[PDB]
Design a protein around this nucleic acid. Structure first.
Length: 129
RNA sequence: GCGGCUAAAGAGUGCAGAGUUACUUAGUUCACUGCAGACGC
């Protein structure tokens, strides 16, 4: 499914992505846009044969099982195909666990490239939440 | 009992809520529910 901007913001909050770990929902709305263009089917293959799944582009090298990455970890305990679904449940839990961890939100590249140090409020402007 | 209007403006608002993510550029304007008025033959 290709979420609209707000339709997403609403679904993200409604799972517990609003101001989780002290990061307002304007950072996750933006993160999904630059990462996947709100499209929950998006995929990109990296030069090393792993692939990025879902609305936030979560790597099969560590986080999920696609079958076609030998020496993959699957730390989120799911098939990478769950990261493609219209139901963002299993792409939030995993987006959560990635952030609740090491670099934190700097573990979000797209976020860290474009939205870190920007008024991430523009991304919620107009949205019935 | 079957249509347009009920916001100058606006893609979108007759008032009151609702929230099934449907629709949409998200919406005081939109799925659902209460009640509508002046009209047309």
């Amino acid at each position: 499914k290709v979420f609209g901007r707000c339709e997403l913001a609403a679904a993200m909050k409604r799972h517990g992505l609003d101001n989780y770990r002290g990061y307002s929902l304007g950072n996750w709305v933006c993160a999904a846009k630059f990462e996947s263009n709100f499209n929950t089917q998006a995929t990109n293959r990296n030069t090393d044969g792993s692939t990025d799944y879902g609305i936030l582009q979560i790597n099969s090298r560590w986080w999920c099982n696609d079958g076609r990455t030998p020496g993959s970890r699957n730390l989120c305990n799911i098939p990478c195909s769950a990261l493609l679904s219209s139901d963002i449940t299993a792409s939030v839990n995993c987006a959560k666990k990635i952030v609740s961890d090491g670099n934190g939100m700097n573990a979000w590249v797209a976020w860290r490239n474009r939205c870190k140090g920007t008024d991430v409020q523009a991304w919620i402007r107009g949205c019935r939440l």
